[PDB]
Design a protein around this ligand. Structure first.
Ligand SMILES: O[C@@H]1C[C@H](c2ccccc2)[C@H]2C[C@@H]3CNC[C@]31N2
Length: 186
């Protein structure tokens, strides 16, 4: 099946806990995979303005580890619940992808999660201004704009609204698309 095929591909790139004990400032992100209309999609947030860290940007759900988190996957799930109301029974964490090093003292750990078909996003307006889906296949042939910095523009065919996706978020989206969609019969 489509979902079993995706999880089996993703498992080959799981690094597990290999890098999780190193002494960094620690953040996790959840890359949430949603099946709709026979295709895979990724779920993105638009961050609120009132936030000190990173206002108005397109990002995956996530944030800073705290002392309650049992492990780095727990951080990602805690933060996804607070931002969009995703509950634990509604997500299966499939793997941990290559972490991202930033600013010399920070390590960001990405987890891929499969999302239950009955989940419906409840944006928390104190953290998130918007929540939207992008088909995974988009990231193999994106609409690119140069700010030189590469920026993707995605227009939702439902309402004509355009979103800009860039930086680590765009890099991780392309990676997940390559892992899941490369070399597939039609
Ligand atoms: O907040 C996250 C994590 C990263 C981060 C960088 C520096 C300090 C803290 C955190 C970057 C890259 C991520 C893209 N979405 C916002 C985002 N900023």
């Amino acid at each position: 099946s489509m979902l079993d095929d995706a999880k089996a591909r993703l498992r080959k790139y799981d690094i597990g806990g290999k890098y999780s004990h190193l002494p960094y400032n620690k953040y996790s992100v959840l890359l949430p995979l949603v099946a709709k209309e026979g295709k895979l999609h990724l779920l993105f947030t638009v961050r609120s303005e009132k936030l000190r860290r990173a206002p108005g940007e397109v990002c995956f759900p996530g944030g800073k580890r705290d002392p309650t988190d049992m492990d780095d996957a727990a951080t990602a799930l805690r933060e996804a619940q607070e931002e969009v109301g995703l509950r634990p029974h509604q997500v299966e964490v499939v793997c941990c992808l290559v972490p991202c090093l930033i600013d010399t003292d920070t390590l960001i750990t990405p987890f891929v999660g499969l999302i239950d078909h009955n989940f419906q996003a409840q944006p928390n307006p104190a953290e998130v201004k918007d929540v939207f889906l992008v088909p995974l296949a988009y990231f193999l042939h994106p609409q690119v704009h140069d700010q030189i910095n590469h920026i993707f523009e995605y227009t939702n065919p439902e309402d004509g609204v355009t979103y800009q996706i860039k930086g680590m978020t765009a890099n991780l989206a392309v990676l997940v698309a390559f892992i899941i969609l490369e070399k597939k019969p039609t």
